[PDB]
Amino acid sequence: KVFGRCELAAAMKRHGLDNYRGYSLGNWVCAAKFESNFNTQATNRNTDGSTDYGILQINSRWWCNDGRTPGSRNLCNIPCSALLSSDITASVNCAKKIVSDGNGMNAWVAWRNRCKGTDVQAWIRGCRL
Ligand SMILES: [Pt+4]
Ligand SMILES: [Pt+4]
Ligand SMILES: [Pt+4]
């Protein structure tokens, strides 16, 4: 599913992401926009053989099992395919574990490079929440 900006903001808010670990909603919407362009079905292969999955491009090296990343850790305890669903629940629950891991949203390279220190509130501007 390709989400609209406000539709996704609303889903993320409902799933407990607004101010999760201090990160306002706008940060999460910005990350999703540049990681996956709001497409739950996004996959991208990394040079090390791992793959990133779904709306928040969660990586198979640490977080999920895809059966093809030797020495992966499956920390969210989930097949990576579950992260591609139109229901964002699995992605959100896993993202909560990731952002709690010590490096906050810096775990998402597009967030660091494209959202961090920008006016992220603009991403939720005009939405009914
Ligand atoms: Pt709502
Ligand atoms: Pt939902
Ligand atoms: Pt594996």
From Swiss-Prot:
- InterPro entries assigned: Glyco_hydro_22, Glyco_hydro_22_CS, Glyco_hydro_22_lys, Lysozyme-like_dom_sf
Enzyme class, top EC level, equals hydrolase
Name the residues annotated as catalytic in the UniProt entry.
35, 52
Q: What is its main location?
A: secreted
The record's PROSITE patterns line, in alphabetical order, gives: GLYCOSYL_HYDROL_F22_1 (PS00128), GLYCOSYL_HYDROL_F22_2 (PS51348)
Give compartment(s).
Secreted
Q: Which family does it belong to?
A: Belongs to the glycosyl hydrolase 22 family.
Can you state the subunit structure given in the record? Monomer.
Q: What's the protein here called?
A: Lysozyme C
Organism this protein belongs to: Gallus gallus (Chicken)
Q: Specify the taxonomic lineage.
A: Eukaryota, Metazoa, Chordata, Craniata, Vertebrata
